[PDB]
Amino acid sequence: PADPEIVEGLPIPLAVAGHHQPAPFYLTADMFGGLPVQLAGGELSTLVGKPVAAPHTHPVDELYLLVSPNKGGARIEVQLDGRRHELLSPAVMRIPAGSEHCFLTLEAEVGSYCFGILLGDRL
Ligand SMILES: N[C@@H](Cc1c[nH]c2ccccc12)C(=O)O
Ligand SMILES: [Zn+2]
């Protein structure tokens, strides 16, 4: 009864440079015969003031997507090659390939999520 169209074995925690625990992936390049993007992220109600990574890079462009049940329920700081940016949910920020970056949760409610959509199949 495993259905080839359904993956329940999630998240997939992958070792990623800059991170101190594995990064929780929901889409990986090896799923469904090969995917053109990867996606990782999580709920940040417990991550306010706690960054998941140091400044890091990836060989592909990465889009951050920040959502929360209430408008403006979540806020993150993103460092982009040393320059502070802030996002208020809902928001999307592009992180160019090669850019040294990371994010910090400054505010979150139950149900706030940040995802990173990696526009390629390599890390
Ligand atoms: N892949 C993302 C990681 C990420 C985005 N949102 C998150 C929320 C919780 C934990 C990890 C994340 C990055 O490189 O930054
Ligand atoms: Zn990243």
TrEMBL record:
Keyword Membrane (UniProt): no
UniProt-recorded name of the protein: Cupin superfamily protein
Presence of keyword Zinc: yes
Binding site for Zn(2+) 5: 56, 58, 62, 101
Residues engaged in binding Zn(2+) 3: 20
Residues at which Zn(2+) 1 binds: 3, 85
Keyword terms, alphabetized: Metal-binding, Zinc
TM regions (residue ranges): none
Residue numbers binding Zn(2+) 2: 19
Annotated positions binding Zn(2+) 4: 56
